[PDB]
Design a protein around this nucleic acid. Structure first.
Ligand SMILES: [Mn+2]
Lengths: 161, 612
DNA sequence: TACTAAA
């Protein structure tokens, strides 16, 4: 049922509004949580998200983030390399991710070397933050032990430019 | 009765060497009617008959290419007629040497002519000029047999010379008519563009009066590198680093300055967060220790490009000045031939004998004496190009005999040679990594275990740094201060002479004997002015000239047309295409560029108005 | 008057 599917998403970690979830549903027929998750993953989060990020995250009033949360990535820029030379090897790679939920946008920093997330990651890709995440100075700290990329099929807007 | 065979070499040194090798020490040598070209006579057996051998040497290109007199008047005909309606003949280079008359007088009665010029291109052109000069002088062939012989060799060795004497070939007309076509294209482009440029720009601007604006397939590409560097310097946006550094005290008076593993962060907020996670802390813990042994590789044999580079960077000498000094040294008989490409010492080179000459100099007395006692390391295997052996010292010298200019070049040559034979510098690298909270830091140092070529070239030395303190994993030291360093990215400096030579050699713009001239040409025509550190600064005239070239036709400055047009001309050398079509076609394509240049010259004139 | 490139 619709309530059963909503509950299933609730423990799955996705937080989406009622308009969003009736948007993701193909029809009031037999639709599984798997296809609901896939359809939501395809859709842009800025129109299906809820108010679940605790707000004021850009300030220092929040200590840590808990629970498995799904977030979208807007911009990725290498803070260890200059704008002109985006592939310089003089510094280890270290990425700053602008991470939205559709309502409030936070900023995360790569604390340990990852492999899944790279500069050639399409904007709109989604990640899951299962575990405990540290909010140091209004900045999320991302580790390979609490970040899982779930892919993404959203209309690309960068086009390498 | 005794027939005579005349042989010709491309330089007096090669002439004397080959005569000594063939004659088994029976030289009869005397100067000719030049003072710079000699004649060596001896006797031998040729074509199964006892005959006399007479051998001499030309001094490079006997002849060069030039238009007729009328089309040199610069006013009778516009440069457009130079491409197709302008005949070209051959005049004499260095007319004071009277080389054509020398070859005329030497050869009266030589039944057979044997040739000993270099096997590369630009040697077949010289051999065919020598043939065209000497043929109407000799005593013909009594029978129907042949007389003109070409000898091919790869190195100046007994076995190679004997094999070249055993097997004899013929000159390559198809190879000669490739450098011939290249000379014709160079003339008819660089004399039809420069005339238009200096009759258009000098005819409008008074500040450029009595000045020359020159174009060429090498000069303009050479200027292109400097102009590109100037463009990159002018268009540059500095940014703001944020590097964090730390100090650790071990016992006393030893404060190690650490370096950040994430060497830089381009965000004030992230840098501040990383500081906040570190500054409120007072213990650092060791985690890693490395004592790997490394080595610095000894330099290869000296090449002409490397000699020019080092003379510009360290000795503070211009390329042409360094080349003239090297030529004076070689003529005086101190170093060997200063225009090479090889970097591999030949097998027969008497390294022990040559290194024994510098066994008494006060500068190398300790190093040379030692290196001759425990054995000499074999030279590095570099590259061979069939040219002359690399620049090595040949006779002993002291600051009294030489001046203040040749001695310094000799000092580097005799020091680079010893470093090529000595050992390597083995330095032990020690790295210690601490952990001040979540972040990481490392400190590195170098200690010399056994200096090798360092003692003969002190400028290329492992710097003296204090040894790192002993510490194994599990030791904790007090922490001092941690702070940001608001560094800023700096724009690149101007192009130096050393860097330009590497750029010139990579694209093959100039040869070994032409690199100094091209760099001097753009510096003597006010295109580029030299500065401190031997840096090249494009001038107002240079900036407007190259920039206008890009707007009109980029195929005049790009450092790829010179290499590409040479590849097209290699078709004649390999016999695939005939001489006329390739030269005719490549002249037509350059004729359309000139007509597109003349009708669009107003594009370049707009830029000059701001400048002059 | 020059010019170009090269042994
Ligand atoms: Mn040669």
């Amino acid at each position: 049922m619709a309530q059963v599917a909503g509950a299933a998403l609730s423990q799955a970690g996705w937080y989406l509004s009622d308009e969003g979830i009736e948007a993701c549903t193909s029809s009031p027929d037999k639709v599984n949580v798997n296809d609901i998750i896939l359809i939501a993953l395809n859709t842009d989060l800025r129109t299906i998200g809820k108010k679940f990020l605790p707000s004021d995250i850009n300030s220092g009033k929040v200590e840590k983030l808990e629970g498995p949360c799904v977030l979208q990535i807007q911009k990725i820029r290498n803070v260890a390399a200059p704008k002109d030379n985006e592939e310089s090897q003089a510094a280890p790679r270290m990425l700053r991710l602008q991470m939205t939920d559709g309502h409030i946008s936070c900023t995360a920093v790569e604390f340990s070397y990852m492999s899944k997330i790279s500069l050639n990651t399409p904007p709109g890709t989604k990640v899951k933050l299962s575990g405990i995440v540290d909010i140091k100075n209004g900045f999320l700290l991302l580790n390979d032990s609490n970040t899982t990329v779930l892919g993404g099929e959203v209309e690309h807007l960068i086009e390498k430019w | 009765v005794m027939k005579t065979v005349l042989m010709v070499a491309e330089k007096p040194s090669l002439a004397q060497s080959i005569a000594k090798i063939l004659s088994r020490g029976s030289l009869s040598s005397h100067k000719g009617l030049n003072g710079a070209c000699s004649v060596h006579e001896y006797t031998g057996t040729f074509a199964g008959q006892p005959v006399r051998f007479k051998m001499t040497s030309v001094c490079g290109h006997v002849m060069t290419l030039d238009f007729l007199g009328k089309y040199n008047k610069w006013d009778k005909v516009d440069p457009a007629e130079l491409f197709s309606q302008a005949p070209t003949e051959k005049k004499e280079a260095n007319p004071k040497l009277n080389m054509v008359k020398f070859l005329q007088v030497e050869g009266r009665g030589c039944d057979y002519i044997v040739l000993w010029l270099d096997c590369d291109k630009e040697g077949e052109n010289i051999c065919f000029e020598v043939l065209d000069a000497v043929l109407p002088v000799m005593n013909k062939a009594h029978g129907g047999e042949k007389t003109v012989f070409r000898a091919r060799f790869s190195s100046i060795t007994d076995t190679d010379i004997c094999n070249a004497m055993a097997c004899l070939g013929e000159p390559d007309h198809n190879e000669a008519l490739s450098v011939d076509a290249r000379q014709e294209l160079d003339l008819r482009i660089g004399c039809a563009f420069t005339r238009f440029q200096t009759k258009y720009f000098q005819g409008k601007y008074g500040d450029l009066d009595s000045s020359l604006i020159s174009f060429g397939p090498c000069q303009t590409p050479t200027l292109g590198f400097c102009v590109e560097r100037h463009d990159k310097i002018q268009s540059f946006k500095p940014e703001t680093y944020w590097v964090l550094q730390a100090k650790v005290n071990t016992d006393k008076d030893r404060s190690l300055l650490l370096d950040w593993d994430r060497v830089r962060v381009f965000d004030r907020e992230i840098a501040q967060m990383f500081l906040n996670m570190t500054k409120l802390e007072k213990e650092a813990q060791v985690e890693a220790t490395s004592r790997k042994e490394k080595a610095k590789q000894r330099p290869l044999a000296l090449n002409t490009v490397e000699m020019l580079r080092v003379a510009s960077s360290s000795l503070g000498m211009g390329p042409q000045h360094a080349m003239q000094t090297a030529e004076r040294l070689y003529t005086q008989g101190y170093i060997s031939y200063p225009r090479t490409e090889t970097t591999h010492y030949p097998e027969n080179f008497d390294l022990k004998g040559s290194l024994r000459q510098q066994a008494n100099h006060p500068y190398w007395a300790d190093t040379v004496k030692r290196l001759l006692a425990e054995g000499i390391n074999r030279p590095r295997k570099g590259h061979d190009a069939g040219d002359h052996p690399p620049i090595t010292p040949m006779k002993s010298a002291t600051e009294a005999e030489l001046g203040g200019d040749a001695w310094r070049l000799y000092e580097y040559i005799t020091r680079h040679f010893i470093a090529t034979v000595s050992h390597d510098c083995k330095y032990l690298q020690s790295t210690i990594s601490f952990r001040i909270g979540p972040e990481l830091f490392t400190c590195s140092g170098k200690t010399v275990l056994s200096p090798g070529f360092t003692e003969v070239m002190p400028w290329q030395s492992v710097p003296l740094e204090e040894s790192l303190p002993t510490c194994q994993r599990g030791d904790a030291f007090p922490v001092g201060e941690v702070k940001m360093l608001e560094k800023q990215t700096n724009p690149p400096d101007y192009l130096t002479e050393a860097e330009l030579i590497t750029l010139m050699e990579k694209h093959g713009i100039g040869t070994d004997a032409s690199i100094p001239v091209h760099i001097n040409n753009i510096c003597q025509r006010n295109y580029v002015t030299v500065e401190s550190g031997r840096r090249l600064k494009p001038t107002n005239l240079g900036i407007v000239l190259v920039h206008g070239y890009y707007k009109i036709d980029a195929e005049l400055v790009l450092p790829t047309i010179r290499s590409a047009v040479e590849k097209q001309l290699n078709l004649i050398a390999q016999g695939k295409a005939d001489y006329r079509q390739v030269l005719g076609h490549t002249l037509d394509v350059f004729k359309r560029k000139f007509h597109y240049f003349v009708d669009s010259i107003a594009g370049m004139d707009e830029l000059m108005e701001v400048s002059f």
